[PDB]
Design a protein around this ligand. Structure first.
Ligand SMILES: C[C@@H](O)[C@H]1C(=O)N2C(C(=O)O)=C(S[C@@H]3CN[C@H](C(N)=O)C3)[C@H](C)[C@H]12
Length: 244
């Protein structure tokens, strides 16, 4: 019905109007489409930031460093975001993007096991360096938007090298919206200790019929933008292409 010229124009506009630069890669079956107002970002490397939480969770549960019911006690230190100053499960930590909890998990896994697991899964550039607790925030781990949607495709279809149980455990943590009768599973990332800042929203749509449509939005965050513009742009784009 609508031409691809209009889809492309509309999706470019969503990025234009938020005063950023970025892309969203969508995958339908085995076919990858690139949209936004900066198409050349697609194969450039950025730190994954809290998008890593997904894999971190996978590794931790697979290797029995945590339980889905386990309560990570707040240590009582002042937290940069007060929504973090509480006890939570990996699940609650996923929604809140509670880095302290994910750092605990990283420490439990340990640098050695972390390095092996990330080679094994072949995630991004696969280098995690020497600091087990911040590699996903400031480097040297980097990944492309194309890689991210492929990782999201793997996970949506349970193709990652981990028990099915582990995958389902981690996926249940990822539900962020129900729209129309479709479900949006995804994780945000905001890389604040890199210059310029990067923003991510990776996951998939599970439609009523059962098909799964993976996506990765990636754009530059600039000082004093709201994090939800990542969501908003993603939603409009999925809706423009009638994926929701
Ligand atoms: C919407 C917004 O308030 C909140 C949110 O969501 N964000 C995310 C996210 O999507 O990864 C983070 S992560 C954190 C920021 N500083 C840490 C760092 N060294 O980069 C990592 C914020 C808490 C920001």
């Amino acid at each position: 019905h609508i031409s691809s010229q209009q889809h492309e124009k509309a999706i470019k506009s969503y990025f234009d109007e938020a005063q950023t630069q970025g892309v969203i890669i969508i995958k339908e079956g085995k076919n990858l489409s690139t949209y936004g107002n900066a198409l050349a970002r697609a194969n450039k490397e950025y730190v994954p930031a809290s998008t890593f939480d997904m894999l971190n969770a996978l590794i931790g549960l697979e290797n029995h460093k945590a339980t889905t019911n386990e309560i990570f006690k707040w240590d009582g230190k002042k937290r940069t975001y007060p929504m973090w100053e509480k006890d939570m499960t990996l699940g609650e930590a996923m929604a809140l993007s509670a880095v302290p909890v994910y750092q605990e998990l990283a420490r439990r896994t340990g640098l050695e096991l972390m390095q092996k697991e990330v080679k094994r899964v072949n995630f991004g550039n696969t280098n995690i360096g020497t600091q087990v607790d911040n590699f996903w925030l400031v480097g040297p781990l980097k990944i492309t938007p194309v890689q991210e949607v492929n990782f999201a495709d793997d996970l949506a279809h349970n193709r990652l090298p981990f028990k099915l149980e582990t995958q389902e455990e981690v996926k249940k943590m990822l539900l962020i919206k129900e729209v129309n009768g479709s479900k949006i599973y995804a994780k945000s990332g905001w890389g604040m200790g890199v210059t310029p800042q990067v923003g991510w929203l990776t996951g998939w749509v599970e439609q009523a019929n059962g098909k799964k449509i993976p996506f990765s939005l990636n754009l530059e965050m600039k000082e004093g933008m709201s994090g939800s513009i990542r969501n908003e742009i993603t939603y409009k784009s999925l809706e423009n292409l009638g994926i929701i």
